[PDB]
């Protein structure tokens, strides 16, 4: 098996997919032109930092680095821990920490969309009579699929007994940092105002200092979830997103109908790939929207529709927003992220979150294996948001620097 050149490899998948044949050149000039990269200053300070996060990635990646392909087309090795051991400054690939910081960007494009649906298998693929254009905002939520990404920010266990993470210090300011000190501040109790133990149903989630999770009854090896750190992280992600979408609404003179996909609540929510913690983290994702929308004016966001299909999240959403009277209209649906009506497309900017991967090319899998891959097959995003096809994504002209204040207001600087 011979490594083929990355750009040629990509163009091959495009012809095998039939995506090369779905759009005309005149439109793709427009969609590719509309690409923007909203980067958080604190983590992506330079044009060099940004372009590295956009490019030093695998082509296809699932199961938290267990399976996939590099950009040259070759499969992932069989040595486990390979990607855990990628160092900062590797010639071609992001380290774990660079994957955490590289997550603090949003890549948008006003992309053509030819169908809605296709994932999951129960959600039928529906062609649009005429292709519409949706402003697709790619954001990589926290991943918990392995133990060396956002696990090391938000969980305390006796294997990595304390966090140890500069450049993310602010997330823990006031919060405990060591496991057994964390045990003792909680003492007799399971939750406090900054952290909580995890229970999927009735028993607790614990990790052997071997490595390996098991259901023990909150004894010495019960893991503790750093709730407040996670919420502070979400406020950064959601701040950036609302600002990005607002600024795009303004620049097009239309208010957005934003499809607020449940970023992070699917594959990324399964510790290892078995233990679903979605029911624990989703409230903080919603409260991030609640707090920011209550505290800031977004004249260019008409509505935010939350696609929510799970009974728990539906009741969680109704709880968290019962109280909410911010100006921006908020509501939940069971409508596919990419499905809009004609009336909605005429009145508003159609906007959607692409729940993406900070360590694979935009679109990721080429089947209908995820929300992103589904978007990857129903739109021009693989043309608009992949440097192999659209080098404008590496142009500093197309970058937007974002500063997030202590009030979480965001100042956007073109160049």
Ligand X SMILES: Nc1ncnc2c1ncn2[C@@H]1O[C@H](COP(=O)(O)OP(=O)(O)OC[C@H]2O[C@H](O)[C@H](O)[C@@H]2O)[C@@H](O)[C@H]1O
Helix axes 278-295, 227-252, angle to 10 degrees: 50
Q: How far is the CB of 335 from ligand X (least distance, A)?
A: 8
Between 326 and 367, name the residue whose CB sits nearer to ligand X: 367
Q: How far is the CB of 356 from ligand X (least distance, A)?
A: 6
Q: How far is the CB of 213 from ligand X (least distance, A)?
A: 19
Nearest one of 161, 343, 135, 373 to 267, comparing CA atoms: 373
Between 103 and 247, name the residue whose CB sits nearer to ligand X: 103
Between 142 and 176, name the residue whose CB sits nearer to ligand X: 142
Between 133 and 259, name the residue whose CB sits nearer to ligand X: 259
Q: How far is the CB of 293 from ligand X (least distance, A)?
A: 20
Q: How far is the CB of 16 from ligand X (least distance, A)?
A: 19
Residue 381 contacts residue 362 (beta carbons within 8 Å)? yes
Tell me the residue number closest to ligand X, measured at CB.
266
374 is written with which tokens? 């589904």
Q: How far is the CB of 362 from ligand X (least distance, A)?
A: 9
Residue 236 contacts residue 404 (beta carbons within 8 Å)? yes
Between 53 and 194, name the residue whose CB sits nearer to ligand X: 53
Q: How far is the CB of 118 from ligand X (least distance, A)?
A: 8
Q: How far is the CB of 106 from ligand X (least distance, A)?
A: 14
Between 112 and 371, name the residue whose CB sits nearer to ligand X: 371
Question: How many angstroms separate the CA atoms of 31 and 158, rounded?
Answer: 49
Between 103 and 221, name the residue whose CB sits nearer to ligand X: 103
Q: How far is the CB of 160 from ligand X (least distance, A)?
A: 23
Under 8 Å CB-to-CB from 262, ≥6 apart: which residues? 282, 285, 306, 307, 308, 313, 355
Residue 55 contacts residue 14 (beta carbons within 8 Å)? no
Question: How many angstroms separate the CA atoms of 409 and 26, rounded?
Answer: 37
Residues that bind ligand X (CB under 6 A): 62, 119-120, 123, 141, 261-269, 307, 309, 336-337, 355-357, 360, 364-365, 370-372
Between 372 and 401, name the residue whose CB sits nearer to ligand X: 372
Between 304 and 337, name the residue whose CB sits nearer to ligand X: 337
Between 37 and 281, name the residue whose CB sits nearer to ligand X: 281
Q: How far is the CB of 116 from ligand X (least distance, A)?
A: 8
């Amino acid at each position: 098996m011979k490594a083929i050149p990355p750009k040629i490899w990509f163009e091959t998948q495009l012809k095998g997919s039939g995506l090369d044949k779905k759009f005309q050149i005149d439109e793709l000039i427009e969609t590719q032109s509309s690409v923007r990269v909203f980067a958080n200053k604190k983590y992506l300070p330079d044009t060099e930092t940004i372009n590295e996060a956009l490019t030093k990635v695998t082509a296809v990646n699932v199961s938290g680095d267990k399976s996939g392909y590099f950009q040259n087309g070759l499969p992932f090795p069989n040595e486990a821990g390979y990607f855990e051991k990628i160092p900062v400054g590797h010639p071609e690939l992001l380290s774990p920490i660079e994957r955490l910081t590289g997550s603090k960007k949003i890549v948008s494009s006003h992309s053509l969309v030819t169908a809605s649906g296709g994932y999951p298998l129960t959600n039928p693929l529906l062609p649009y009579r005429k292709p519409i254009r949706v402003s697709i905002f790619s954001l990589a939520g926290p991943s918990f699929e392995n133990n060396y990404l956002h696990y090391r920010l938000f969980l305390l266990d006796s294997v990595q007994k304390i966090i140890d993470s500069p450049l993310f210090s602010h997330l823990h300011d006031g919060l405990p940092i060591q496991f057994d000190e964390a045990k003792k501040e909680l003492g007799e109790y399971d939750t406090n105002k900054l952290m909580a133990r995890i229970r999927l149903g009735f028993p607790y989630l614990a990790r052997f200092s071997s490595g390996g999770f098991y259901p023990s009854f909150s004894k010495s090896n019960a893991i503790i979830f750093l709730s407040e750190a996670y919420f502070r992280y979400q406020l950064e992600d959601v701040s950036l997103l609302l600002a990005s979408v607002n600024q795009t609404g303004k620049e097009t003179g239309k208010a957005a109908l934003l499809k607020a996909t449940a970023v992070g609540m699917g594959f990324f929510a399964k510790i290892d790939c078995g233990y679903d913690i979605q029911h624990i983290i989703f409230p903080y994702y919603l409260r991030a929207y609640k707090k920011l929308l209550s505290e800031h004016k977004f004249p260019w966001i008409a509505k935010i529709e939350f696609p929510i299909f799970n009974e728990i999240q539906q009741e969680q959403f109704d709880s968290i927003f019962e109280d909410y009277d911010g100006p921006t209209k908020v509501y939940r649906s069971t409508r596919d992220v990419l499905e809009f009506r004609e009336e909605e497309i005429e009145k508003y900017l159609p906007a959607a979150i692409n729940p993406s991967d900070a360590f694979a090319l935009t679109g990721n899998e080429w089947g209908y294996g995820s929300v992103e891959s589904m978007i990857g097959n129903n739109s021009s995003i693989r043309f608009d948001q992949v440097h192999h096809m659209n080098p404008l994504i590496l142009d500093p002209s197309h970058h937007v620097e974002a500063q997030i204040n202590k009030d979480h207001g965001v100042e956007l600087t073109v160049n």
